[PDB]
């Protein structure tokens, strides 16, 4: 009973035992099923082009198809309608940085990976104009959430419309990439490479955002590359204690 065998294998915190249980792979169907569980739990499998169904199992675990499947289910009983903060509210029943960012957060929460698109651009321009005090990268990371798991759409949209000046907007791009890649496994490092590139930038807040995005893009991956890239730069005497804490 490989599926629940693997469930208890994960329950017992021993990745070696989990790998041993997964090794059998006597049935293609059950093999793919347990690969699905491993991917969903985010436990990182380890192998290469050395076994049957290696490619499809790798894609299953990496969760490359999660966004497409989610969008397909949404289409089934289509829910791809952006909603105005008030519409999520009902203000009809009866603009500082504070409520501007609050509304942006509400929109990002409600529209999760639905590709707000037109409302996305509208609210993007709104909070870009309302850039003030804390009207910082926050809203860019919000766009990142609206494009959560949307490696294609999220990365494309941020790339074409983001960056430039306003190191806060560049940190917004970094955190948007991190959010898009969050819980998204793939050998490609669209978030890792960028955040490692801009990790060493002097700007304290932008570096903080870059490191936060790097951590949260592959949170739980448990690999060692980013750990080796980050632990040396743990020393934050040249930076702030908040930067030290967020890197931790």
Partner 1 sequence: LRQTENRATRCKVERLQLLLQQKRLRRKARRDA
For partner 1, the binding residues (CB under 8 A) are 55-56, 59, 64, 151-152, 155-156, 159, 163-165, 170, 186, 188, 190, 193-194, 197, 201
CB of 152 to partner 1, least distance (A): 7
Identify the residue whose tokens are 């903080």. Answer: 208
Which is closer to partner 1, CB of 164 or CB of 228? Answer: 164
Q: Which residue, 34, 73, 77, is CA-closest to 57?
A: 34
Q: How far is the CB of 165 from partner 1 (least distance, A)?
A: 6
- Taking the complex as a whole, the smallest distance from the CB of residue 159 to partner 1 amounts, in Å, to 5
Residue listed under structure tokens 């999760």: 112
Report residue 50: phi and psi, to 5°.
-140, 5
d(CA 213, CA 216): 5
Residue 55 CB, nearest distance to partner 1 (Å)? 5
State how far the alpha carbon of 172 is from the alpha carbons of 47, 201, 208, 223, 236, in Å: 35, 15, 11, 25, 22
Q: Which is nearer to partner 1, 47 or 99 (CB)?
A: 47
Nearer to partner 1, 197 or 242 (CB): 197
Quick one: 48 or 164, whose CB is closer to partner 1? 164
Count CB-CB contacts under 10 A for residue 156.
12
Q: Please choose, from the candidates 76, 72, 38, the residue with its C-alpha nearest in 3D space to the C-alpha of residue 58.
A: 38
Report the residue number, 130 or 170, with the smaller CB distance to partner 1. Answer: 170
CA distance linking residue 158 with residue 230, whole number of Å: 25
Least gap, CB of 191 to partner 1 (angstroms): 10
171 contacts 205 by C-beta, under 8 angstroms? yes
């Amino acid at each position: 009973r490989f599926p629940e065998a693997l469930r208890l294998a994960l329950m017992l915190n021993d990745m070696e035992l989990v790998e041993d249980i997964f090794t059998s792979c006597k049935d293609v169907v059950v093999q793919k099923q347990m690969a699905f569980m491993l991917g969903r739990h985010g436990v990182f499998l380890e192998l290469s082009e050395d076994v049957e169904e290696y490619e499809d199992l790798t894609e299953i675990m990496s969760n490359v198809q999660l966004n497409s499947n989610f969008l397909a289910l949404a289409r089934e009983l289509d829910i791809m309608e952006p909603k105005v903060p008030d519409d999520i509210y009902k203000t009809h029943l009866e603009d500082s940085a504070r409520m501007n960012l609050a509304s942006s957060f509400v929109n990002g929460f409600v529209n999760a990976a639905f590709g707000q698109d037109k409302l996305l651009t509208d609210d993007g321009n709104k909070w870009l104009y309302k850039n003030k005090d804390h009207g910082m990268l926050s809203a860019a990371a919000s766009l990142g959430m609206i494009l959560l798991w949307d490696v294609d759409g999220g990365l494309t949209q941020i790339d074409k419309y983001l960056y430039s000046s306003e190191d806060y907007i560049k940190s917004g791009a970094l955190l948007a990439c991190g959010i898009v890649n969050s819980g998204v496994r793939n050998e490609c490092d669209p978030a890792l490479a960028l955040l490692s590139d801009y990790v060493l930038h002097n700007s304290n807040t932008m570096r903080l955002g870059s490191i936060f995005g790097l951590g949260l893009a592959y949170a739980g991956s448990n690999r060692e590359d980013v750990l080796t890239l980050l632990l040396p730069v743990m020393g934050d005497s040249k930076s702030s204690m908040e930067v030290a804490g967020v890197t931790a």
